[PDB]
């Protein structure tokens, strides 16, 4: 049997995995998007169902001033004695914290803020002697030597016990990070990422008889990397290991699927899966001697996408994210039942601080995305539509707007410091269907007059100008519904009847 | 004593070096630019003076349809018994050839086309038994196994003797290339690049008692790389070795100086220098155990930039390049003595096939570039100015033009599929000074009214949208003087009095 990588497509980076019996749970980083820290469930490591998010309340997730360069970085999920612990960093606040749950269908706890624990990529390990260890990166604010730091932690108090200790510098790659401590067959293993989460990314491992070291570098490090290859999967690393309930070992990690030359990726970092074999002399090797592929053998894992939202429920589906904490009063599923009613503010897609926007990840290179919008702009500033969005300086939109008394459908782009209206056609009714056809190299923007079914191609845009390499930050493209008054509050409400995401 | 890398700043990739006595010569790749294959001279490996170009005649350099993805790829320069051999690939033609010279102040020979020798990165080695070997990459047209291929060559005939043989696959990095064969202390060494000329770039070496192998991989390969580091120098490789006349060994190679995040570079790949030490057991190691720095120790090398062209000579300076083979009739240094007179054609900066353009490399992150232009456009299509140019889809320009009867100074950008006029101001005289201030993140476009000395900032543009990562291809930014009639021949001549390049 085979499976395909990525196992979780689209923007799902920094996967951390946790087994409870014959169930598996996985979390990913979310940066400036709300809610934060998606959590998935699987019984076979290949097929994952999103069960919700870990950070859903303002008290857990403070994203004011957060961007696709900041907000929530790598999360780690662990389970001990019936309690789940999610530990992560809000980089906008420069603070590490934990939330807890004993019931994954309910919400997680208020955060426990870990004072005097800096850096990113915090992780937890529960030892057999009752001690709990927190492990993370160097803290740049304190001018620490680059490497992996660890201390004992008191989980109730949110406090460190004893001293914060450098335990391993890694093999000499940049940005030694993503540390996880495990104990397997009498050895402590410290698994990390080096080289940065770009084309240099790799996984390395060390081991020790003691949890604080000294750690011996694996002699065949790195144990996973596509650096210096032209494989379709790149930037592979940030791994977390699991022993499946049949006894076999596996790693989850992320990688990208870049296109063009030089390589550029727009679907974010995507979660992948590979087997682990343990060498006779006690070291893990991931995949096919440190490499992986799009098609992989499933071992004995038991092997087993069109999304249409009609907005019929008064609860938002788990596909939807907002930019930072949303202004809840500007989105309503009750004002017009069976529609989403949005109130645009002065903020636009060029502003970081929560414009009126709701979006879902692009998870496929080839897909068709559409929405029906009712919008009668009252004044020239007023605008609502459908966006392909990377960050505040990299986004394309097709929208209804008003200029000099006339209603126009427009195609608008922001790329870096360039803001352009690419095309504009007069439009003569109150409802419109917007559709975007994505392929690897371009998005094609069309509108349909609902009353006739006639489609019109308004224009096109390059995927590569929305790529992470171009745009900056740590995220993937979203498709979003938005409204704005372009420096004033938007007096016309925007009503979206439905949203469709149809992958090829 | 110290020196700084890069030793040759700006777009100077794929350096090949050749010693003749106490003189050193070095060549670089030039892609679609004319003339082709710059050649430099040094006596100390650190300071290089450009002495001209190797490919200066249409018979040597056929660049019709060439782009910054094609044209002339890596050159190799060798010397035997008073004759210099320059061997390279015109990738637009998919052909390898050699030109020869016995006098570097004169022009090189007509090409000898090497029939049935495919791939890129051809190199020559003259053995002590009188045999000459050609070495290069796999030929994708023939579905060859990836690796380094070699044969004996008859240099007079331009023909291969005997069989084309795969001699080494490399260590397992992508794109094994840049092969050079040497013979040192009884071993044949095969030095190559792997990983691609981007963030995976590295140098590896193998050795054999025989020129065709079998080759043993160096046990500490790679011997040079910045992969998986955050060093300011990246993408390092494509090395060629020299023994300096004091007996010490050195490598030249290229690397980039990227900025922003993810890393993006706009100055091209730049030539660097590092020492070699030979291990007791007969392997070379480059630099500081396989890494290098911006400041390096000069060993015993004897250690030792404002450019102003007034156009007073009827010979173009060696700074100037054209896009492909120029239409010579459209550039004149004689029509108005002490000025460059250019005739714009229907072709624009968006067209690959030789628009009227002359340019010089950006060689510094911080510099000020200016020109005085006399231009009285006769019709609305007509345009002349100063460009910052990466390729046909990535360039910014400040220019004089005409629209609806009125003369305007404009700032124009092409980025991918976006073509925009960023700003436009009416202008009321026949001469103008254009100036661009570059810094690492942005170019600032100003014009001066020559008659008053008053400067005006017309606008700005991001360096990152001209970077190779964004734009594609294999080159660095140029600053150019251009004219165009935007689909018609430009009826107004453009006269440039001078050009200044003032680095910080
Ligand atoms: Ca509906
Ligand atoms: Ca002059």
Residue numbers in the entry:
A (entry chain A), B (entry chain A): 1 to 304, 311 to 510
Question: What did the publication describing this PDB structure actually write?
Answer:
The β-1,4-xylosidase from the thermophilic bacterium Geobacillus thermoleovorans IT-08 (Xyl; GenPept accession No. ABC75004; EC 3.2.1.37) was found to be stable up to 55°C. The enzyme has a broad substrate specificity, and is active toward various xylans, xylooligosaccharides, as well as the artificial substrates p-nitrophenyl-β-D-xylopyranoside and p-nitrophenyl-α-L-arabinofuranoside in the pH range of 5.0–7.5. The active site of Xyl is located at the narrow end of the funnel-shaped central cavity of the five-bladed β-propeller domain. On the other hand, the residues in subsite -1 are fully conserved, including the catalytic base Asp-14, the catalytic acid Glu-177, and Asp-121, which modulates the pKa of the catalytic acid and keeps it in the correct, productive orientation.
X-ray diffraction data sets from Xyl, Xyl•arabinose, Xyl•xylose, and Xyl•arabinose•xylose crystals were collected to resolutions of 1.70, 2.10, 1.90, and 1.70 Å, respectively. Of the five glycerol molecules in the Xyl structure, the one in subsite -1 exhibited the lowest average B-factor (10.4 Å2). One calcium ion was defined in each final model on the basis of its electron density, coordination geometry (pentagonal bipyramid) and positional similarity to other GH43 protein structures. A metal ion is bound to the carbonyl oxygen atoms of Asp-316 and Asp-503, and the Ser-344 Oγ and Asp-503 Oδ1 atoms, with three water molecules complementing the coordination sphere. The calcium ion likely has a stabilizing function. In contrast to all structurally characterized type II GH43 β-1,4-xylosidases, protein assembly analysis using the PDBePISA server suggested that Xyl from both crystal forms is probably stable in solution as a dimer.
